[model samples]
Target: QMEKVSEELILPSSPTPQSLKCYKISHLDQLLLTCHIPFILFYPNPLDSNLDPAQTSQHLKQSLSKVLTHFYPLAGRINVNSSVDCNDSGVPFVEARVQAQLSQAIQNVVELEKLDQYLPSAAYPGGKIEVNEDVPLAVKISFFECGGTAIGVNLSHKIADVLSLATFLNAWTATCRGETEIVLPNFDLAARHFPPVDNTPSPELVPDENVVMKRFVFDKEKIGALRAQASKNFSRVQLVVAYIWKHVIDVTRAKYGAKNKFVVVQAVNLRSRMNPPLPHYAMGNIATLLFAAVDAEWDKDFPDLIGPLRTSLEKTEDDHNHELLKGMTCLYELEPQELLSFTSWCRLGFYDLDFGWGKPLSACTTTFPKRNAALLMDTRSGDGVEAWLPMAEDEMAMLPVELLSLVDSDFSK
Candidate 1:
């Protein structure tokens, strides 16, 4: 049983003003906006019984207001007008807009669950942000009678990143818990600064040219099949990543040749990179990329590839590997046009993004038109994972028949 309630919730008379203008001047602009989408589930902890819906909603609103206070400098001054000339003196490069919706009737449990699925998709249909003068950034909150809540926020990547979003969420949560002080990150120090005279050339980068996307599911039985194939020799880590890396290597090598081979680009969060792991409230992109290599000839023995790949992935965590990535970032920042092509095989194993509604039933990522990247996310039933792979139509069709066999067998069973 579910119900819907609609009502207008107004912000308090004293809304904070914005400050500091954030500018978007790079290709990684989407990160600033997309990172906020996760916080839609952060507050109200739908699973926490002590928190009442109306009270929780109000708390979240207050929390948002408090966060705005710290970010006011960045929020108030940024303007989202694209038509304004770059030379315009008073125009801000970024702007944010916040919106809220109300519901009237209360629904039953089953109906409330339905709202969860409907709202995220319906509110954010198309998932692409449209710039307009009326509202620069859009922050929308959808509330149901059963206390189920959903938030939809959109921002320009030039303004903030995942770390910034985390900062906002932690502050909001702290406010909800009635904490007097919430430790915040030093944004001034975290901001990227230009490096001194360095002349290293950026790595050869390849633009993502393929738009074709293929979704594959691995269930318990299929995982059993994978395990059977591995027998008692491989660890779970080796079984999953190693298997995926093998396929990527085989496909890439056949097309680009052994000498032209590149490395697997993995995203490593820099929370622990410093002497003390950065606090949860730190802002900006505190992530580093690590690479795993492949030789074109390694695919001949398909069954034995797991061992070496696992070792390579393990070696990627060494201190030197991290330093190398920092060096690459330095070079890339200095020469944005330089090509630094690497394929990312992302693993979202421990993101802790759950907000008491259980893990996301299914989540999809926007595709990069011309990049070699794959995202692996865990399923609700922790036993399996899903992979979203984007490849050229021809390359996808040319994927080894054995790889297809495994995926199909897993799905069919």
Candidate 2:
């Protein structure tokens, strides 16, 4: 159980200049939901540390306020024109006290609902907030009885993606450690590339029923084995995606006794793919989805899926990426069960986000309730990958032994 100690709006350390007050939302950003991308990073109690609980929370809030001076858009509210009005409005910062030790909280099979308590609130799809009043970000810091800490962050997808989140977190931690200067982010580059539209599209995926989320840890050796099965060229992300798509299709066929049409969508970062390439600091939704579908009358094999995935990756052109968004509404024609979306958070340096405390013991995300959605992030050791997949409860039960075999040991706790 947890009790809220205090809740306060943490504003930027300084006011945004009048010249840079309006932050334009990109056309790609218009296609995404205002759904908050939530994540929690768990740190064990540092044996050599001497700071008390109150002091810890104070350090976090102060550093957050300082960093907000750079990420000013997050402390601001979205406007009716689908742009951020950097009016120095604050982000919600919450402090909570947890009764259990950190180990007790994470030891067992993860209960997804229990983890929700750590988040500021649920920003579910179809539950969009009023543009004029919505805060772009919020944060929570939970202190466990044994002095272990968990930092929970909820950022609107309209304003940021996983890369942006990583940038912001890195900046925050560096500031907390008294770094000289955090790298400044480009707020206008994305809008320059994908200009904002008059009318933005609504979110496609609505919340589904009986969807359960589970974390499966794939060790280094297992990942190597999967890579061997696929190809030397296939990266861990592609190999893992191929494995999941193959097994998910197998599970679906076993349940229905028919070859069903399945499509797997992967979110491709458009930064490097763009002509001239956007820099890493170019913020907002600089990503697009690339889809690979199962061929009828073809054999269901791991290599079969990987080939199409690679083919689709090769087909992503700058012009084609923009054109794809026009059909964003039509993208979800398949039923939720038939669609699988994969987002890789690997190579994002989330595990390296070190505050004054040491690196996080475990880092994970709160499940997005969309069916068959998978988030792949690197394990703490950086050698392995942890795939967090949420699907229908029944479909989860039908997951094949081969997919489950990779998760022989759970190090998330």
Candidate 3:
């Protein structure tokens, strides 16, 4: 339902300084999956839009080039020495024409699995990423028939995480509008703090072909009910995660006819949790995963899961606690089905990102590319939480059946 129009490399408007050429990857970065992190922001055709599609595309490329001058390492290649060679190799910029109207494509982008087409294939050649010598970033501008646009950017996880990408987007959008006080990035802080380790491990899970992705929204009312039922003062993420954890556990038990151990692995941002506290704009992979082990009783109540999850999170509260990198090795011991992974993009203000036009209708990671993994994002209204889970087909079917009442949509059924 999409046709590629053009593809080219977009070089930085200015060159990187000689002193800032080589960016040392962090220890946290070494532990991350060597794949492009996919993010797609969908915007409805602006009501007062003056520029045509072609003009909008040109404006984006120009603004992107300017942004690259500041985030110069993003336009470079990932070197074999666990560092980014900040050469002006340029990033891939792609343009595509979507045959569908905005209304049709926006109904449920993740559920429909149309996000892959919106992304730049060059960033993920052969349906996989090996990471060395690959471009650190790539962008694709997909223009729908109704003039609505989807901006997809894939940044190699070795150099940046979702938080870094959000900061980059904020800077790029500010640059697009000619804002002077752009939030500049700091590529050195993370590596200085954690420092790269030579033998850092790679991800073990491979993207399975049988996996299917589905998104379900838990509106404010349901969340409130969950809060009351849980009978605790937990954050939105904690409560929502606990709720989902209960169902996933129940589903797994039912499928296997046994109560096997399960681990809910969640990513924790190390920027603020560090002793010295790095600024929010600190780039590279400044995050680590926390594994919440559940070897307790088989049928876990919603409230029962919160304790372990919260405890796992509290570990990050310690100033010098990023020793959590040790948790990565523990993941090797678990079976694939025994794992449930979640990462939250809440409070990042992705819905507020504007580039001359109005804010996006929705912002989400289109391609999950991981089995038994999900991402939690704030709803457009900010009063709800949307969980996008990509898992095996049978588990996907079991999800709604387990929590049919809490979800905003019966569409999954």
Candidate 4:
């Protein structure tokens, strides 16, 4: 009976208006693994008590179709190891009904797995997932028994990254609100800079089956405290990461022994750091990695990491490999237990995605394709943050013991 809390949702529709238009997947896009970047956001139902699910569903479907015309690349399918055919093959749009009140489900801050039922599909689909589908986008709009609603969107990593998704999503929302003009993304140059190659095997697409995920919520006051304790010179992300890196290292040493070597890798948006930096609205996978090394003989002080973190960012910006994304990067291990990666979506304006309904009460990302990756996002209030970390089961057990004692933890799985 306890499962009834969020379960019992109904899917009223699936993949409608099959389209038949085609295009090529760019070189930069082909470098990415064929997977879906899943995002789930919950919006409070407008106060109108007589709201109709049919009307909301129609609005979302129509708006998405109109926006896809602008982001033509997404309307088509991913060709094997080659280009994305920007065909008019209509995107999959599903409408659903949630049995519980939206408030009842979202009052508890949890990880992506908790919201999977509301999503169109799993966050990280395994190798069994087909690379070439009719369209690159998958969307689901669920109406809670109460007025609240959950909007789950999945974008194909093979064609676009989070950057492109946001651009398209916001533009669609603006279209819904009837804005005259919006920033159109430039996709023509995406392939020019780095030519797409065919025949190379893609990177791993599935995560460890036994992975465990946890959500750590840090408000402004708590983050301020962490910043103070770590280093005033560092930013919220730097200090937050410094704290996690240190604790994870300590935990690994304490449980598994001091013999383990760890590396910290973070994804940096290259748009601003590029030579004659690209516009903020530049689309496609325009991000690269920034990494640092930590061994059994590393510095024990928390604040000391601030310098290395800063230097790593500066160094990456200076040398910023324009071409090295998917393959090996300075001993980045392919083994499951070798490293930890983080990406911050803090200032990406995710909180500002206001459709006609209102700002989302909470927006969540599903699990990463990597077992030890962490996704840092802004909490609903913008002043707070949500650190969604995924790891193996044994390592996750150590988080609450000492690592999470440093801050308030929402939930874990």
- Summing lDDT over every window of 10 consecutive residues in candidate 1, give the lowest-scoring window: 88-97
Model 1 regions more than 4 Å off = 1-63, 70-167, 170-209, 219-228, 231-238, 254-259, 301-360, 400-413
Off by over 4 Å in 4: 1-26, 48-50, 109-112, 126-134, 315-327, 332-335, 400-402, 405-413
Residue-wise C-alpha lDDT for candidate 2, range 110-172, written one tens digit per residue: 566567777776656433332222678899999988889888888888888899888899899
lDDT preference between candidates 1 and 2, better one: 2
Q: What TM-score number comes out for model 2?
A: 0.92
Candidate that scores best on lDDT: 2
Ranking by lDDT: 2, 3, 4, 1
Candidate 2 off by > 4 Å: 125-133, 256-260, 315-332, 405-413
* Winning candidate number (TM-score): 2
Positional deviation of 219 in candidate 1, in angstroms?
4.2
Please give the RMSD to the true structure for each candidate, in Å: 9.3, 2.7, 3.0, 4.9
Q: Where's the lowest-lDDT run of ten residues in candidate 3?
A: 404-413
In order of appearance, the predictions have TM-scores of 0.56, 0.92, 0.91, 0.86
On residues 30-144, what C-alpha lDDT tens digit does candidate 3 reach at each position? Answer: 7676677788888888888867888998889999999998899888888643777788889888899988877776664435455677777533323553433367888899998
lDDT of each: 0.42, 0.79, 0.77, 0.67
Q: Please give, for residues 277-337, the per-residue lDDT of candidate 4 as tens digits.
A: 7776666777777767666667487777667678778634344333364326454553445
